[model samples]
Target chain A: GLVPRGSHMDIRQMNKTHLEHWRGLRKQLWPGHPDDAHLADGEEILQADHLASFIAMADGVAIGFADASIRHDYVNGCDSSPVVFLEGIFVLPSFRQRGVAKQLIAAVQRWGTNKGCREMASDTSPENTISQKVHQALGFEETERVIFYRKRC
Target chain B: DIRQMNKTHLEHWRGLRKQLADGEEILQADHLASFIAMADGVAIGFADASIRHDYVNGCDSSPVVFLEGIFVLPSFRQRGVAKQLIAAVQRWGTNKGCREMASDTSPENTISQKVHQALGFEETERVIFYRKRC
Candidate 1:
């Protein structure tokens, strides 16, 4: 019921009423994970003080969502303790290039600052060039590139 | 001698930990453990580990013991200091009910990769991280 051009977009913290939309957007971002898993994690995020999730709405229709957490352990590329880590972010394809992702990140920045965090961090697969570009455009600086190793104990 | 890091070794531990990024702030956290290799009343190597509940690449179990950092002086290389330190961490992790051990190094550090392989670790994945001041 609204025009596509110059539409009013709003970002708000995820609430009960926004769970369905948030989960839908999350599915778009992480298709490998099942919807039930997303719902459970989303519910936990709503109750956890150290975690936050935001949903972006354009003309009252949910178009994107972002998730973040306050990490107490060491976060790669962060110089401070208790960093705010961006776990995931996504915008509908139709909403691309419209600043939806930027607005979502801004909301996360405000939340992190209020929680006394001086740094925010995120990561992507080495193959995800698009994500890397987006991160750079959002004022992020490239940090360490690493290879993970593990052993069965 | 290789022993679990204790309050008395804080100064020695800090000195050797300078080789790691943000190693200073990494101390005093829960679910964390460290071991030091000492010779002639001085620490020559150390390893720090933590129980991570988050999803660690290539780990099948939750609460995996992650090697946050490990370092040894050049003189101590090939003397098995790193091996002993890792053994200490392994024993601690086993007691804590962790079935896997995880760690990471930069992609360009092939020497580290070989060292990890020698220590029974397998390469899992590669990733790049980004950050912004908030």
Candidate 2:
């Protein structure tokens, strides 16, 4: 077995300098979206209240990022008033299994607690079994499954 | 007739909510409204709607009005009770500045799907909600 030395992992609040790094990871997570859209959305998150973003760094390199928001609306399977919803999370393929995602979630948890939320929530597509496993591994519980419908008003 | 739910209708709403398994706790949340369908001084149906600021699948706008749940008694079916309840919800949501209305049902509930289509709702997406205490 080989052990790497001098590798320090830390989570930082997303800021101006790391905005591009976060956007790049977001693009990898949602490849269908364009860079402009990711940057625009990242800017919006940076300026919004009750929303927070975290970046995971290992040895000075950005490995992952997580975006969370305080949802006052009704979140399915939640019993609390305001819940912290994980809007997005992504870690580089090479960084997987290195606890980067867990650290990112911890940063989000602290932010949510400071913002007065007592519960955390998230969702994924039915076919995304890997994401589901990751969610459960990060302490999430399966709440409910639903099919969405919409109508123009 | 359809009217916004009030304290006087709490018990009736509770009785109607018995059929909607996921709607009990939602009644106490903020930014949500409930409407009741009345006929001959009896509550026959009800609907719940909430203003959602989070991203809703298949919707292009934020602050969507979500149809949390809707239920009409068996004997009151086909009398337009559900429609009236939803119409009231639409008016409430419109006043709240929502441009879209969203709803969901279990995948196996085809009857609910049929009713949703008849009420002008289109299929959007399927998802599983997960949660954890922080």
Candidate 3:
């Protein structure tokens, strides 16, 4: 029940565990995002851009995972400075409501700042107030919501 | 767009798969596969690298993003393919936290020298003597 937030946890790139874990989460998070079959075509995904994966563990068991990206665009405040964009910050439900998400965001934020970033921001579904609180607690300001449509969901 | 990119290899994807000991797979299914079509179907051009914790050159194991190898196909030679490709990769690295981008050629590839010149790439150290552009 105790997970210290530090380098004590094994943080590495996406491997077998990372892939399968995210695949499952994709279903739960965005049920219509993608299917398990996408796992077979996973390698091609990592190449799309710079994806960093940090997994939290305790007692030799994986407990959580966090990912983020550096984005620069013409979206007003977002495009000017190198911003830290949290991809899907998730932790095992058993590990949620804890400080796991905060710890994960911290690691990536530090990385971004070190890389000379301007701001660190994240988004959660309107229905996911739990995530909203998390973002707020972490000093994140809410922004406008624009719907996104993907082809062949 | 990402899906279409994977299947868009030009003239059969091929590039620097060797020489780098990082063991980091340049191509992966989940994300790395996105670059398999980076060259508009020819995965030949790339700035391959890894993230490691190195005090030198400020390396980090998380995503150090080193420039591995970059190239252009025969048909795509010149026409600024390599330069544009490097620019794209540089943008990636810069966004990934790299303060500067680094790469090298045979030092004899005049074509490379000309391209680098056009890009204003400055040489750091040359084992052989050569005059800098005045």
Candidate 4:
């Protein structure tokens, strides 16, 4: 129910109690979009593998969330197996640049280390400079940015 | 000799795999088609590929050739060596009846992206996944 901070933020391991906040947070993350699909995906990840989600609260209000999982399949740029993938993370606009998100990521990293994961991996769009900077600031090295292409044959 | 990996080229291919990363899979003869790029009768670089039928983002249900890696000696960089290796793999994929080919690299690896794009690979999607091990 608590993680490290300079006294304003409390990061917690999310559960059923946090679903509502997570739902609203997810809605806010996708601008002009409100759908349950991403939420369902998060739920599925939790149902298996004890995949984790972290929620950040400031003054008892849920402000952000970060989700992660253990993926054994080929993840772009990963060199080894069973990499810890940071599924998705988001924080309230009002909470931006205040280290709330970093705490969420730190929580995930600690959990990953406990689980024996050797690497933490995540990705953002090539156009999202903010995301790239955030990841870099967290000591993440950019491995590759690839655009997937498909054709009907 | 620029041919499929067989008993003779196994050592060279293993050398390249070691360069990929520690604990990376050592592809079997059946799991991969290893193509070696040779110069003056010596192996300089190699490309590995496999057919993937699983969900590959923008790809459809049909199996596509996936370029797992392409490695060249530092001295052989930019001699169209990597390009030729990929081309040879594409031909092999075509022979296997694939209609598309796919690969990926680090977002920071812009050079690899440019090399791929220059060869007619289109950029279709960009995504990042995070992981923690317990």
Candidate 5:
């Protein structure tokens, strides 16, 4: 197997470009979101107490990233005996097909295992096949999928 | 499974009637609206979560969220429906970055206790069960 060509980092640091990149990635992954603009990556990062975030960098530009957070055995998107949960992981189309996704999942699993998790978990909406395929290829079984509804509050 | 549960019936419920009577400790429209589980066209049941919005009430702060009470009409009991309702409420709470989710129920309300336990809640009673010498 080819070793990951990009440098995979697990730093508690994120620059403006790094922040902007992931927020942009979220919009790409989940389109038509009204509140996408307000995602301040730094404050969002702080919320993840046992966060496992890996940035895939090549030639000094941060091209891809993945982020995860720890929650109880249950969460909104989790159903079957939850553990640490992945939040964001996106690589540009150009960065795909060369193990970027695998490297990212590996980094998050290591982070969760270090924090005393037996197994790692992640989610993708019914819409995102890339995330689904990545998790399946990495041996992550399906836990649960749920939809949300809204009313004027 | 068939009972006359209408505005008159709602007018008879102890909790809603009490709230209507005293405007304090009430579960108003927003409380129902914020709640996620809606079974019938009209919400026949409710799990109320209220807060002292110190900012809105002009006080400093302390209580952010309070689990008032959950009530389902007699027809809705014995199912895990209340558990489903409160679990959804807790999920909403977690999404909002809430820390603690709590409720108070009489010790003999076994059904409510079951609902709380299903969601990982444990009793925090400090009183020891004791008997005085006769």
Candidate 6:
């Protein structure tokens, strides 16, 4: 019942300040990753239309973020050109259960659409049932299943 | 039951293979390493993986087990057959001393993505490749 107060939720392409906030939050989203990786990944936010990052903010503090891109290469399950693939989406726990995620996605969709993309694609680990449901609810459908393998030879 | 796909089970493999190969000539390469699931001696589904040495998307190491394809008959959908088939492939990878196994699917395959997650596969990375860009 404690959503961020007022009609202050804002979603827009990330700027330098928003990038710093997102990097801090990404560490929370991916705890096991090395600290240095966050800095490297944060650099991706600045790649223009090829790759973009968005932020959801309320009363000036960023509450959520979504990273997406216009993929022109071969992407599995995609049957079209220039797919908009969502690389990641994260929200502050207290600010969730609201529509912040929806807003973040809308920004990415607009970015991708502006770049001439028709398909918006994203992924989540199978164990993350919540994400799977969220993506499905957003109109994305599943296409194929695979399990990778490895060996010395 | 799950086992290596052999000559006797070729018909079942073909049915499951069609979903992926989709009219591409089913040559010897297609037969590289196929595993099947059986229900009372009938093929119910199949899973195949390829071992690769070259750079694979999102893979941290080389010589990874790359999932080629996995299909379960409509009648057997939602069952655990696909997971079991994956396990068979993992076992094969372990025997071969593979350090990691990786696979990917189009963003459209949400169901497959969930299956991979449910079976312990992490979503490593997602990128679109550009074949020809001026």
TM of each candidate vs. truth: 0.87, 0.90, 0.43, 0.63, 0.47, 0.55
Local error of candidate 3 at residue A20 (angstroms):
2.8
Residue A57, candidate 3: Cα error in Å is 2.0
Using TM-score as the measure, name the better of candidate 2 and candidate 3. Answer: 2
Q: How accurate is candidate 1 locally (lDDT)?
A: 0.86
Taking the tens digit of each residue's C-alpha lDDT, what string does model 1 give over B1-134? 99877777788888887765233434565588888899998988999888886657678687788888889988779878888888888888878988998899998888788899999999988888999999
lDDT (Cα, tens digit) per residue for candidate 5, span A10-117: 323344456665666666765866444426444556565655466676666666777776544233233333356666677889978878677776777767766766
* Candidate 6 C-alpha lDDT tens digits along B1-134: 89887677888778767775422322354324678898888888888776654445667665666677788988898879888888888777656656777777666777888888888777766643321111
- Docking class of predicted structure 4: acceptable
Evaluate every candidate with DockQ and list the scores.
0.77, 0.81, 0.02, 0.29, 0.04, 0.09
Tens-digit lDDT string for candidate 2 (A18-89) = 988888788888878788888888888889997779988887888899999998877889998689988888
Candidate number with the higher DockQ (3 or 6): 6
- The TM-score of the first chain in every model comes to 0.91, 0.90, 0.70, 0.86, 0.70, 0.86
> Compared with the real two-chain complex, what DockQ does model 1 have?
0.77
Report how far residue A91 has shifted in candidate 6, in Å. Answer: 0.9
Instruction: List, residue by residue over B42-69, the lDDT tens digit for candidate 3.
Output: 3544333332212112221233333435
Query: In candidate 3, which residue ranges exceed 4 Å CA deviation?
Result: A1-11, A33-45, A75-79, A146-153, B1-134
Please report how far candidate 6 places residue B52 from its true position, in Å: 14
Q: Which ten contiguous residues of candidate 4 chain A have the minimum total lDDT?
A: A144-153
lDDT of 5 by residue, B33-97 (tens): 12423345444455655542211111122333445556776775666656666666666555454
* Candidates 1 and 3 compared by DockQ, better number: 1
Docking class of 6: incorrect
DockQ winner, 4 or 5: 4
Higher lDDT: candidate 3 or 5?
5
Error of 3 at A13 (Å): 4.0
Best DockQ among the predictions, by candidate number:
2
Error of 5 at B131 (Å): 50
Model 3, position B113: C-alpha lDDT score: 57
The alpha-carbon lDDT assigned to residue B10 of candidate 3 equals 25
